[PDB]
Design a protein around this ligand. Structure first.
Ligand SMILES: Cc1ncc(COP(=O)(O)O)c(CNC2C=CC(CC[C@H](N)C(=O)O)C=C2)c1O
Ligand SMILES: Cc1ncc(COP(=O)(O)O)c(CNC2C=CC(CC[C@H](N)C(=O)O)C=C2)c1O
Ligand code: NA
Ligand code: NA
Lengths: 427, 428
């Protein structure tokens, strides 16, 4: 990649949530292997982010590559209307088997935001079919579910800046962010949620939350009793529960799915990211036959959704390989060992002036700071330490591949500890 | 593939816009090559659908395959936040160069619906940043732009059953479907409805959004290019942004590289997908002008607020680059022109069948519209029995084949269509 290439990127290529006028530095990556990203000039970086949490098996994984190349040899893609294929069937068999028993119907889609849109549409169509006037969603503050208009409508109105779309987005119900930590349970915490449930129980189509961990909305880790109470409340009121596990699914929090921490099953489950081992985009939204059949028996005769590339053979094959790796079960001790090391190596950050909080769960390690990070300056510092860490807001956090070596994880935590010693990289 | 596999699929796997309680049969596909799909039982079918518009180079294309395998060797994926890579840069260079001069800023995304959502958010943020009170979209009836919630808000309310979401979906403005045909003459009267809505709401409209020339899902309609010339001029006069959704028409399908070329106009925002990757896997792109891209970033947000996990996916970009490289040979132009002539010639006799309401053709799109709806299970079986994959929808029996299709293969497709409509058997 020439300098002109980089110039073109800066002036012509929009990057995720960043200015086209005040771009901060980008780093040119040529390849990746194991837990390392390789830059154009040869610099090798230990990946602390798993490419936004998806690459749980690292990069250039033999199993993943083999499955992908083999599916390309058969067919990378064929349409899913009136046709089915082995990769979709094998993938759906695994998804049904690995999730709670009631979740036995699968709607594959292209991305996390779309999987959330699908779950939302499922709930609305469900009630439309039952002839129940229910169109509200009840969610938590600090929640984040994606970037498309439906998903945006259930994101924290303050973090996702709902003022920008005030008038276009439907108005949903936002209970207080869960206060009890993953910590002791305080009954005082339920008051806000209960309040909204009592006043709006007749019109709520579904409750939607990220289980245990609220990711992009603040890397918050809350008490599982919340999920227990919400499942019970939904059960009593006849409301659907949507669990967004696009970030928490496939082992990240120490359990296969975060709902397991509370031993609850949602009515609708959204999955993505690590689904494909972070090789390419794919999502899945699972629900019950009660939901799936009711919808088909309604006025529309079917669930009204179906994107062009639905069921893409290549992506399904990658996902099959990713799930196959998890089948060994090795992730359980890998994540447990990571958790221990994170909790050990991040503890010193609690002596640093710039730190507000340190919290760890499975392969998620968070250092919350008192002031906003300088994302450009901190990223450069990290690159200089030979690590890839992408902080944002007041969070310097790690979500590494499950296969990361102790010495690699150590470089990440050391860099973090060093970074927070200095106002240098803040405001 | 076993029959148990088919049972699992029927009972546990949702398919696009189809019932779970009253299933229709699906056909198991094990592989595909050239312009053929290969069923699990060994039957080979000539593909008449291009897997919904996208597989313009067919299947198991050596150039696409090699490009995908090579990218896997480097990295199938890496995040795009604070990172860039060669496949993304090359693709964006190509996209900027092949589209109208003003369109030079590229937002890569995952799917067509997301690309439309991005276009719509761009329009909203553009006006929110100039301090103007514009949150409505003006679109045409019989339009389809995706099935995520924002996209649904600009789809035809009847065709997409907006009654199901009545009260949840924002109410946009719907001008009548364009009446003048690509085949025929322009009629000034066509404009009254659109002109009327514009005059009454010119002040609240953030953008006009349409599919140029061909409205796909909403009826496979083919309208007169004068429509786009007018819409461009009107948008220009009123200071309104024009969004062209070319997710279906892009990359040669209508006989021109982009359907906007039939009118020689450029939109402010252009959405692409489908054939972008040669139908190998999902990827989309929304391009806009410097004026739009810079204005948004200077707004309160400080940036365009969107960024999906797999944005810029190296693997998909590599496939898209290979697909575009194939189109650089220019061979598609004659290929599509020849397909067009053959479709016109061989579907023409369908116009004398009693079951046929209309026959219309543009580039590598051939449509036989019928008077009654098709019997899906029955007609699908007939087609497969003829050794062809044609998937009709409602009153439309259509062909959109890969550009590489051989005349003999194309002839089997048209023969089958003509045979399907000769009597009332496969209808209702
Ligand atoms: C829990 C959850 N649900 C849905 C989605 C949307 O999935 P997509 O595939 O459509 O993106 C996500 C997406 N996860 C994200 C993770 C990180 C960021 C950005 C963090 C920070 N602001 C930064 O700039 O780096 C955004 C989305 C999800 O987690
Ligand atoms: C013009 C246009 N714009 C947007 C989209 C959305 O792209 P996705 O990748 O998100 O799907 C598309 C393509 N989407 C569809 C087009 C038509 C249908 C209906 C098919 C019909 N039911 C049938 O069986 O034949 C569905 C999605 C597009 O063309
Ligand atoms: Na299950
Ligand atoms: Na251009």
């Amino acid at each position: 990649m020439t300098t002109d290439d980089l110039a073109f990127d800066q002036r012509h290529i929009l990057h995720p949530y960043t200015s086209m006028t005040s771009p901060l530095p980008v780093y040119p990556v040529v390849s990746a292997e194991g837990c390392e990203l390789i830059l154009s000039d040869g610099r090798r970086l230990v990946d602390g982010m798993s490419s936004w949490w998806a690459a749980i098996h690292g990069y250039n994984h033999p199993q993943l590559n083999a499955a992908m190349k083999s599916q390309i040899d058969a067919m990378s893609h064929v349409m899913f209307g009136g046709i089915t294929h082995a990769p979709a069937i094998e993938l759906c068999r695994k998804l049904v088997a690995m999730t709670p028993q009631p979740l036995e119907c699968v709607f594959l889609a292209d991305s996390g935001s779309v999987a959330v849109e699908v779950a939302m549409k499922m709930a609305l169509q469900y009630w439309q079919a039952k002839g129940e006037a229910r169109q509200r969603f009840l969610t938590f503050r600090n929640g984040y579910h994606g970037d498309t208009f439906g998903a945006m409508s259930v994101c924290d109105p303050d973090n996702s800046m709902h003022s920008l779309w005030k008038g276009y987005l439907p108005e949903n119900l936002f209970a207080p962010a869960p206060q009890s930590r993953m910590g002791e349970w305080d009954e005082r915490d339920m008051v806000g949620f209960a309040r909204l449930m009592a006043a709006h129980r007749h019109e709520i189509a579904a409750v939607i939350i990220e289980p245990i961990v609220q990711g992009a909305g603040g890397m918050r880790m809350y008490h599982p009793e919340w999920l227990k109470r919400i499942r019970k409340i939904c059960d009593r009121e006849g409301i659907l529960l949507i669990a967004d596990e696009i970030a928490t699914g496939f082992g990240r929090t120490g359990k296969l799915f975060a709902c397991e921490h509370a031993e609850i099953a949602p009515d609708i489950l959204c999955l993505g990211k690590a689904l494909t081992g972070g090789t390419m985009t794919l999502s899945a939204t699972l629900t019950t036959r009660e939901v799936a059949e009711t919808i088909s028996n309604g006025e529309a005769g079917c669930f009204m959704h179906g994107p062009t590339f639905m069921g893409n053979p290549l992506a399904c094959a990658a996902a099959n390989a990713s799930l196959a790796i998890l089948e060994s079960g090795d992730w359980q001790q890998q994540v447990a060992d990571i958790e221990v090391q994170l909790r050990e190596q991040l503890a010193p950050a609690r002596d640093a002036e710039m730190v507000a909080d340190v919290r760890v769960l499975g392969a998620i390690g968070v250092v919350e700071t008192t002031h906003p990070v300088n994302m450009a300056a901190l990223q450069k510092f990290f690159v200089e330490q030979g690590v890839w860490i992408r902080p944002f807001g007041k969070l310097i956090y790690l979500m590494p591949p499950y296969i990361i070596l102790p010495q690699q994880l150590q470089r990440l935590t050391a860099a973090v500890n060093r970074a927070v010693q200095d106002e240098t990289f803040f405001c």
